[PDB]
Amino acid sequence: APTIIDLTCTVATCTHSSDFGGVLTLTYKTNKNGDCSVHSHSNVATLQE
Amino acid sequence: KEKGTALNTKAPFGCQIKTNPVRAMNCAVGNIPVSMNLPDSAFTRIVE
């Protein structure tokens, strides 16, 4: 699994609408390319992907 | 002969004057409030 280092949140814009009304971009530093899981450990937010 | 200065040459705010449908055009005075109703199709989704 591609390792991730220096993970950082930066919410571009948040609007607590009924649908997915908030976009956050994560800046990281990986070693290779691929796919792997994402999730919000807390409950106040629910990810689309 | 003695008409004097017409309004075409002393109208305030640079208002040009046309006669036939007597009117003052390009009067640069005041503010125009604008209320606009838009369909959501015009906007763009944040996710996009």
Side-chain angles (χ1 to χ4, degrees):
Chain A
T3 54
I4 318 304
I5 308 85
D6 310 352
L7 195 56
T8 44
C9 260
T10 315
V11 47
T13 166
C14 174
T15 315
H16 56 81
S17 163
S18 207
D19 90 9
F20 299 103
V23 187
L24 76 91
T25 189
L26 301 175
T27 279
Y28 62 88
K29 212 158 62 66
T30 192
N31 45 283
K32 64 193 290 294
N33 301 312
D35 310 282
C36 46
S37 301
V38 307
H39 168 243
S40 89
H41 283 293
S42 163
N43 179 36
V44 317
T46 308
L47 303 181
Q48 176 188 100
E49 321 111 289
Chain B
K1 199 195 307 310
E2 326 153 71
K3 53 168 150 210
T5 55
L7 184 59
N8 304 7
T9 61
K10 79 165 168 297
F13 300 112
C15 293
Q16 329 198 333
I17 305 297
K18 310 299 189 178
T19 284
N20 163 230
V22 50
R23 60 194 177 185
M25 300 202 308
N26 310 333
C27 285
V29 75
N31 309 6
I32 314 182
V34 181
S35 174
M36 42 185 78
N37 175 280
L38 320 176
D40 51 26
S41 63
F43 292 86
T44 304
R45 316 285 311 175
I46 318 164
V47 305
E48 198 281 335

Short mmCIF file of all heavy atoms in Angstrom, two decimals, chain A residues 13 19-20 23, chain B residues 45-48:
data_model
loop_
_atom_site.label_atom_id
_atom_site.label_comp_id
_atom_site.label_asym_id
_atom_site.label_seq_id
_atom_site.Cartn_x
_atom_site.Cartn_y
_atom_site.Cartn_z
N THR A 13 -13.87 24.98 1.05
CA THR A 13 -15.10 25.68 1.41
C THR A 13 -16.06 24.67 2.02
O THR A 13 -16.21 23.57 1.49
CB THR A 13 -15.74 26.36 0.20
OG1 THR A 13 -17.08 26.74 0.53
CG2 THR A 13 -15.78 25.41 -0.99
N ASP A 19 -26.90 17.88 1.31
CA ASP A 19 -26.03 17.04 0.50
C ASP A 19 -24.57 17.36 0.81
O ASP A 19 -24.26 18.09 1.76
CB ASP A 19 -26.42 17.19 -0.98
CG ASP A 19 -25.67 18.31 -1.70
OD1 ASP A 19 -24.72 18.92 -1.16
OD2 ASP A 19 -26.05 18.59 -2.86
N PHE A 20 -23.66 16.84 0.00
CA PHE A 20 -22.24 17.04 0.22
C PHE A 20 -21.85 18.47 -0.13
O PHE A 20 -21.54 18.78 -1.29
CB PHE A 20 -21.43 16.05 -0.61
CG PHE A 20 -21.71 14.61 -0.26
CD1 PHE A 20 -22.51 13.84 -1.09
CD2 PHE A 20 -21.19 14.05 0.89
CE1 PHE A 20 -22.77 12.52 -0.78
CE2 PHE A 20 -21.45 12.73 1.20
CZ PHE A 20 -22.25 11.97 0.37
N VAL A 23 -15.85 20.78 0.53
CA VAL A 23 -14.75 20.21 -0.23
C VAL A 23 -13.45 20.46 0.53
O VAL A 23 -13.12 21.61 0.82
CB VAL A 23 -14.67 20.79 -1.65
CG1 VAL A 23 -13.63 20.05 -2.47
CG2 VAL A 23 -16.02 20.74 -2.33
N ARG B 45 -21.82 23.51 -9.42
CA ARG B 45 -21.65 22.74 -8.19
C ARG B 45 -20.25 22.94 -7.63
O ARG B 45 -19.27 23.02 -8.38
CB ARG B 45 -21.90 21.25 -8.45
CG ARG B 45 -23.11 20.93 -9.32
CD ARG B 45 -24.44 21.09 -8.59
NE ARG B 45 -24.44 20.43 -7.29
CZ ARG B 45 -25.44 20.51 -6.41
NH1 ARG B 45 -26.54 21.20 -6.67
NH2 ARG B 45 -25.32 19.88 -5.25
N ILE B 46 -20.14 23.02 -6.30
CA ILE B 46 -18.82 23.13 -5.68
C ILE B 46 -18.00 21.89 -5.98
O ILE B 46 -16.81 21.98 -6.30
CB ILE B 46 -18.93 23.37 -4.16
CG1 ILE B 46 -20.02 24.39 -3.80
CG2 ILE B 46 -17.58 23.84 -3.63
CD1 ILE B 46 -20.41 24.37 -2.33
N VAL B 47 -18.62 20.71 -5.89
CA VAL B 47 -17.91 19.46 -6.12
C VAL B 47 -17.29 19.41 -7.50
O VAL B 47 -16.41 18.58 -7.76
CB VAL B 47 -18.85 18.26 -5.89
CG1 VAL B 47 -19.48 18.33 -4.51
CG2 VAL B 47 -19.92 18.21 -6.97
N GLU B 48 -17.72 20.27 -8.42
CA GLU B 48 -17.17 20.33 -9.76
C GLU B 48 -16.22 21.50 -9.97
O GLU B 48 -15.26 21.38 -10.74
CB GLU B 48 -18.30 20.41 -10.80
CG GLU B 48 -17.88 20.04 -12.21
CD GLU B 48 -17.15 21.16 -12.92
OE1 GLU B 48 -17.35 22.33 -12.56
OE2 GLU B 48 -16.36 20.86 -13.84
#
